[PDB]
Structure 1
Amino acid sequence: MRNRREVSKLLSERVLLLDGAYGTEFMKYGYDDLPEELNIKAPDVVLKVHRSYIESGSDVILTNTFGATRMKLRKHGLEDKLDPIVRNAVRIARRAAGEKLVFGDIGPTGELPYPLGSTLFEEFYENFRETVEIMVEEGVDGIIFETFSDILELKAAVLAAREVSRDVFLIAHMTFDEKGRSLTGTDPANFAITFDELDIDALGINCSLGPEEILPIFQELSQYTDKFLVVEPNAGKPIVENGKTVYPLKPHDFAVHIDSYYELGVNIFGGCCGTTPEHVKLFRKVLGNRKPLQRKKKRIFAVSSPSKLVTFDHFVVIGERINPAGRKKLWAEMQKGNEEIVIKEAKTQVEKGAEVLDVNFGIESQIDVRYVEKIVQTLPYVSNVPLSLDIQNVDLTERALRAYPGRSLFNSAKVDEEELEMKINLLKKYGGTLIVLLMGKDVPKSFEERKEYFEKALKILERHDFSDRVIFDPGVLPLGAEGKPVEVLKTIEFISSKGFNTTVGLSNLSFLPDRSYYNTAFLVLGISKGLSSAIMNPLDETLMKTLNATLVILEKK
């Protein structure tokens, strides 16, 4: 069993060849059973197929365990056979492989995350954890999550795997349709940006499409990650012959694409549905011995939900309204667990032009940890947009970052060591970006004092390798309370000039009659100084219409 350092070393030296399909091979041998059941019922057939790929030149084979998790096996009455199904698979693959690499293969459960299905993050996590435990015990050289269709389920899988073993090489794949989107709406850039920063070793694509159609999708993925890359196309577009779906792309037509994947930085090439030992033999000849190509990723500041990637290259409206402060009806409905009221609020803000939603749960001691976990997982699917997680308890913060389906914005660390460190460390583990609020030991009054917090923040962020994952909040103070908003505008201009995104808690300025007018005037002024987002009320039609006018006037849209 090789660890991820050894596998990464090997990959850095040469492009490796994976294996082909298993189901279609088993069928040609007269076995139409659920593939995973053959590990118990006909281990000889599984061994023969592995050996046919080893003899065809594969450097890596996948264990016969695509469907071997409790949640998937339960659908076939096999839940109680998880342990022997998986141990047998690994032993059988190791027997075939000798010195070649054996990767534990895990596919998705077929269950959609709540609220599309019934399953919460923690249930998927435990499901994947149990299979990974068996595989690591049995001595796999790596774990590959093949054919995932949803980012929250894949996030659970990779986090569970890494929890079991910090040492195992981990590969995460999504499968994309012809429009370049997963089942729940994720495009390759979103997949790459969300997963590049998790502690996986490689990203990749398999299934759904043939080698030609995967090319531009793979290219997009390759542009946004510097990690190892893997591809396993189906053997062309499926056709039906005598009422069965067949993947008819022949070895040469398939193999001729290898150079194009090599040019995009591929590290491991194999095949999915319809790929046979004949294909792999040719791939072995065509690939040969190649050192992988170097690439440099494109870097952007973006946050995501399953279906939406929001890049801060334009003014971002962050809806403030899911926040029960001074909202008696929302507060009461949150305390009891009303989800529908939160969903309606989320959807209305989006309808009015919010691109990200801030989500805050008032007095957090009064709120059900499970309600939080539920709403966090739910809103990105139903409202379509990413969230700004506005959470104070470090503990609830962890639960929310875990269950968050995409790459979130995390609403706020002040410039304080203990606080920045805990929050940077959670975001490093679970993914995400951070709003850094420019205050600490005291609330600053002047531009100069804010500048000092900015530079102090930059120091801390540089030392934690986190400078590229922050937006700064200069700290809007109430007008009535000597807020000195000119000092905030000066700060916006300054940070903006340094290349960093900014945001404000806009409504805090006018905490007054005619607040809509103070908020509107400040936002216009802030945008003219470079303000790149704001946490604000999208239901304020004066504010939103004057915002649109401002962007039009300034040639931003």
Structure 2
Amino acid sequence: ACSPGCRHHLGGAGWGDAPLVRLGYNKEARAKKFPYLKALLERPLVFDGAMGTELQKRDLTPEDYGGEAYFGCPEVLNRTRPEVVREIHLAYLEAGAEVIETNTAGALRHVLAEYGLAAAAEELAFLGARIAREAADPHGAFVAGALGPGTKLVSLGQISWDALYRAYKEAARGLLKGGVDLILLETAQDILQVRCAVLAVREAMAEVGREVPLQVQVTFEATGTMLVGTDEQAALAALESLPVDVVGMNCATGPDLMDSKVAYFAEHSTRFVSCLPNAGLPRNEGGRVVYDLTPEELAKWHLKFVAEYGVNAVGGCCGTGPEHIRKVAEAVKGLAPKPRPESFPPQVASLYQAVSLKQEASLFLVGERLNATGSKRFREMLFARDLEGILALAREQVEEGAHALDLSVAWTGRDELEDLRWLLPHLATALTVPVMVDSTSPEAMELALKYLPGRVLLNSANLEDGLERFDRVASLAKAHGAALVVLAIDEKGMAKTREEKVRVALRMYERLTEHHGLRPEDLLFDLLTFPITQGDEESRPLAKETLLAMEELRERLPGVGFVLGVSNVSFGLKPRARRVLNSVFLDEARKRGLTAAIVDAGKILPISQIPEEAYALALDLIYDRRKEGFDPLLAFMAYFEAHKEAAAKREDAFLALPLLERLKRRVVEGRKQGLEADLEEALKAGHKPLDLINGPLLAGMKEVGDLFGAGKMQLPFVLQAAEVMKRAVAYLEPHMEKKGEGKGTLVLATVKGAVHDIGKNLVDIILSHNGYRVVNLGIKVPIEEILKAVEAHKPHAVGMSGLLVKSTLVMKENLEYMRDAGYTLPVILGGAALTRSYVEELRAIYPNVYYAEDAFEGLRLMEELTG
């Protein structure tokens, strides 16, 4: 049945025990194979609590981690102190944890590189797995092979796909040899990282010859999204077409804020559902490090989750212990598990939100104007490398009704891939709506899927060049969990008659559903839109042929969608004529079964707004209604050359607001195109350079900080705003009157032992873009080296960062060092576990120490202290 195009390793085929088939998630068939999933049907399995906050309780020294170089790495304890890891496992098993997690989340090349252990991930993964079996096999319990998100965000360009894929592949080998009962991807922050890690571990399954179940889990930030800005609706929509088995949450902030999120996963997911909150964020109660979630409260949460919502697996994360799991194992034993929903509503998604493929009484509209062949303006800015101009175009089609966007960079004598690699990093975070990737090259689609988050659409697969290319693209759409446009062209040519369209649509449907295991709701069948208006005879019945096929295939293929490029029906006509025929063809298509269209969104006219004599002649064209004498094409052109404004459109003045308000809205909305012209307009009108910085520019920067903190703006849009502010400062900097000085300088560094840099490098970017000089010394920096930089650079303040409670004690040591060396200058501490209370405690050592919750407080503090 297969051809050389086929590749059913990652996604799975339509036969056997593949994760997805034509009727959705394989629930009954996969349970038979995997005893973990078999038990989820029958009973709520209990997971372990934390590994790391247990390891921190122990009296651990540098020699226990094999020396000073690796002090604080959890993964080396599988080699250097295996019994300490086992001790914890055994204590959860005695509390009643039917599943435990291998101490292997940080076991990745690029994370392990920071301890000089880059070559060692497969090793440390193997050892942590073996330890876990030796505990679990005595107690008759399952082992889950934990893998974490790393230190480097792929959507924002901190690591490539290829390296991130390399790391998850080798770490999964290590687990699969060690004999894990499932792979578990956890604490995910970046929806593209999820897809990368899922495909990786599915390949490592194909290499070692053993297939285990897949459990993927995200963390939400307090604001209510993932770090990179993905909501729960989008996260789920991305996971529901991937080869996974369980979806869920871990860590985050506690059960309080996780509640509505797990309510969503529980209601809609056709997969099983996991849920593992931490004990909330730690505090310091007179020396001792305290968590506020009691075990009695965690039982009263997991009872609600398991018995009201229908959550299958329950457990804990950072700052829970054996006492938490004890009370959880009690509360859930003998509850009858609710069966998971049978089908899932078809949707796609961007980085940030999901979109239904069925729109009620309406259409999924795909803006057509990012097409090099089909838009002079796009073509020009593509070749001129005008990034701002392309985002203005893309942004513009959204404002007019675009649910998604079509992207086509192909042009004679250009490299399609070179242009794609420039563009897609920017689009991946720029766009607020999903992409449809338009290409005849399977390698162009492949590249695109390594860059674009969410769930995507591929345009198209057909049988033009045989079964190779068809199967190639169909496997690709199965793996990345993308929707597939199916065009009706076979090896003998384009399908012109209705009988030709059905035959071809029927055969492809059969390859995709039965062979490749695709759902109907994944397919959008494109029958052909040919130009009926060019002049020729044979071409007259061709829009009719297509509408009649589509109403036949709607009845014969219940689940499917249909897509058309309706702007091709009108070729060989004037702009204004084209608009009207396209608006009418679109409406008759909806009636016959069309669910989706490729259109210029803002040039769709409602049927109410079309002249009636024009409307009826449009019908006469579309359905081939031709009397002797009466030529409906001539009368249709006659009409437009007579009636002057029959389809005229001006759209203007969206930003025609007050000048100072416009400048501020430029920062908040992140719009740089036109920025410098407006800033000049303001200077000519008497506005002083330094008044514009501290007036409308600073106000929109406070507003950007106000919205982000409340969950009303996402992280990439915050980096956009600062970019607008950067350009603004560069423009007005030459013209200012009290010249001679900068705003201020901050030496910044993560502390000795602290490996994570995402939030340090956000503070760098945000402060530098606002014209603060930032000497970023990197990670693990000793205090001796910090004060060398200070003595050289004469900064206005010192900033220290680190994620953990041990980071906070190192900062206390650094203040004791700085006090005794005689330093008096301002220090600014921040960090994920660092609280406001603990810094006020530290003021007894060093008076001029301040606390930052985020980089916008650093903003505030830098302003305040520099003057």
TM bracket, shorter-chain basis: 0.7 to 0.9
8 A Cα contact 2:567 2:582, kept in partner: no
The AA in structure 1 aligned to 2:321 is T
Residue type of the partner of 2:570? Answer: S
Q: CA deviation at 1:402?
A: 4.6
| 2:157 is aligned with 1:113 | no
Q: Secondary structure at the match of 1:407?
A: coil
Task: Report if aligned partners of 1:56, 1:277 keep a CA contact under 8 Å in 2.
Answer: yes
1:82 partnered with 2:135: no
Which deviates more, 23-32 or 415-424?
415-424
Please report how far the alpha carbon of residue 154 of structure 1 lies from its aligned counterpart in structure 2 after TM superposition. Answer: 1.1
What is the distance in 2 between the residues matched to 1:200 and 1:510?
A: 44
Query: Residue 381 of structure 1 aligns to a residue in which SS?
Result: helix
Q: 2:84 corresponds to which residue?
A: 45
Q: Which residue identity lines up with residue 535 of structure 1 in the other structure?
A: I
> CA shift at 1:218, angstroms?
1.5
Q: Which residue is equivalent to 2:135?
A: 96
CA distance in 2, matches of 1:347, 1:378: 13
For residue 94 of structure 2, what is the amino acid of its counterpart?
Answer: E
Counterpart in the other structure of 1:410:
458
Larger deviation: 314-323 or 167-176? 314-323
Secondary structure of residue in 1 paired with 2:230: coil
Q: Which residue in the other structure is 1:273 paired with?
A: 318
Change (3 A) 1:3 1:456: closer
Matched, 1:507 2:567: yes
The verdict on how the C-alpha distance between 1:257 and 1:218 changes in structure 2, with shifts beyond 3 A counting, is same
**SS of the residue aligned with 1:389?**
strand
Q: Give how far 1:157 is off.
A: 0.7
**478-487 vs 148-157, greater mean Cα deviation:** 478-487
2:354: which partner in 1? Answer: 309
The answer (yes or no) to whether the contact 1:506–1:534 under 8 Å persists in 2 is yes
CA distance 1:364–1:295, shift in 2 (3 Å)? farther
Change (3 A) 1:316 1:516: farther
Q: 1:473 aligns with which of 515, 519, 526?
A: 526
Shift of 1:452: 4.7
Q: CA deviation at 1:246?
A: 4.8
Aligned mates of 2:227, 2:552 — CA distance in 1: 43
Supply the AA of the counterpart residue of 1:536: V
Q: Secondary structure at the match of 2:351?
A: coil
CA distance in 1, matches of 2:301, 2:548: 54
* 2:543 alignment counterpart: 485
Is residue 131 of structure 1 aligned with residue 171 of structure 2? yes
Q: How does 1:180-195 map to 2 (within 5 A)?
A: 180-195=224-239
> 2-side partners of 1:246 and 1:528: how far apart?
66
Higher mean C-alpha displacement, 282-291 vs 365-374: 365-374
Counterpart for residue 17 of structure 1: 46
Decide whether aligned partners of structure 1 residues 525 and 337 sit closer, same or farther in structure 2, where only a CA change above 3 A counts.
closer
Return the letter of the residue paired with 1:104.
Answer: G
Match of 2:782 in 1: none
Aligned to 2:371: 323
Cross-structure match for 2:212: 168
Match of 2:405 among 323, 337, 357: 357
The residue number in structure 2 matching 1:249 is 293
Secondary structure of residue in 1 paired with 2:323: helix
Aligned counterpart in structure 2 of residue 260 of structure 1, from 291, 304, 316? 304
Q: Distance in 1 between matches of 2:488 and 2:289?
A: 59
Secondary structure of the 1:274 match is coil
8 Å Cα contact 2:277/2:316 also seen in 1: yes
Q: Deviations over 1:282-306 (max 9, x none)?
A: 1122222555321214522211122
Rate the CA distance shift 1:157–1:476 in 2: closer, same or farther, 3 A. Answer: same
1:534 aligns with 2:597: yes
Offset at residue 68 of structure 1 (A): 1.8
Q: Secondary structure at the match of 2:274?
A: strand
Structure 2 counterpart SS, 1:197: coil
Find the counterpart in structure 2 of residue 63 from structure 1: 102
Q: Name whichever of 25-34 and 193-202 sits farther off.
A: 25-34
SS of the equivalent of 2:564 reads coil
Cα root mean square deviation, aligned:
3.3
Distance between the aligned counterparts of 1:251 and 1:74, measured in 2?
Answer: 37
Distance 1:41 1:336 in 2: 57
Secondary structure of residue in 2 paired with 1:79: coil
Question: Quick one: structure 1 residues 134 and 461, their matched pair in 2 at CA, closer, same or farther if it must change by over 3 Å?
Answer: closer
- Aligned residue-pair number: 545
Structure 2 letter corresponding to 1:431: G
Distance 1:496 1:534, change over 3 A: same
* 1:218 alignment partner in structure 2: 262
Q: How many Å separate the matches in 2 of 1:548 and 1:404?
A: 38
Instruction: Quote how far apart the aligned CAs of 1:458 are.
Output: 4.2
Find the residue that maps to 1:191 and give its secondary structure: helix
**In the alignment, structure 1 residue 155 sits paired with structure 2 residue 206:** no
- Please give the TM-score of this superposition, normalised by the length of structure 1: 0.86
Superposed displacement of residue 434, structure 1: 1.4
Q: CA deviation at 1:190?
A: 2.2
- For 1:111 and 1:544, the matched residues in 2 are separated by 43
Q: Which deviates more, 454-463 or 60-69?
A: 454-463
Residues 112 and 262 of structure 1, relative CA distance in 2, 3 Å threshold: same
Q: Where does the alignment leave 5 or more consecutive residues of structure 2 unmatched?
A: 1-30, 62-71, 611-867
- Name the CA distance, whole Å, in 1 between partners of 2:289 and 2:153: 25
Cα gap change, 1:399/1:249 in structure 2, threshold over 3 Å: closer, same or farther?
same
Among 285, 288, 292, the residue aligned to 2:337: 292
Q: Distance in 2 between matches of 1:427 and 1:157?
A: 17
1:428 alignment counterpart: 478
Give the residue type in structure 2 aligned to 1:218: V
Tell me the residue number matched to 2:494.
Answer: 443
Q: Which letter does structure 2 place at the counterpart of 1:265?
A: G
Determine whether 1:521 maps to 2:581.
Answer: yes
Q: Distance in 1 between matches of 2:44 and 2:448?
A: 38
> Residues 487 and 463 (structure 1 numbering): CA distance in 2 closer, same or farther, change over 3 Å?
same
Q: Is the 8 A contact 1:471 1:500 kept in 2?
A: yes
Structure 2 distance, partners of 1:377, 1:516, is: 37
Of residues 331-340 and 282-291 in structure 1, the stretch that sits farther from structure 2 once superposed is 331-340
Aligned-partner SS, 1:273: coil
Is the 8 Å Cα contact of residues 21 and 273 (structure 1) preserved in structure 2?
Answer: yes
1:145 aligns with 2:185: yes
What is the CA distance between 1:62 and its match in structure 2?
0.8
The structure-2 alpha-carbon separation of the partners of 1:544 and 1:102, relative to structure 1 and needing over 3 Å to count, comes to same
Distance in 1 separating the partners of 2:310 and 2:597: 38
Answer with 286-295 or 202-211: which moved more: 286-295
Instruction: Specify the code of the residue in structure 1 equivalent to 2:202.
Output: R
> Any residues of structure 2 matched to 1:371-382 within 5 Å, and which?
372=420, 375-376=423-424, 378-382=426-430
Report the Cα offset of residue 6 of structure 1.
3.2
1:282 equivalent in structure 2? 327
Q: Distance in 2 between matches of 1:268 and 1:31?
A: 32
Q: State the secondary structure of the residue aligned to 2:92.
A: helix
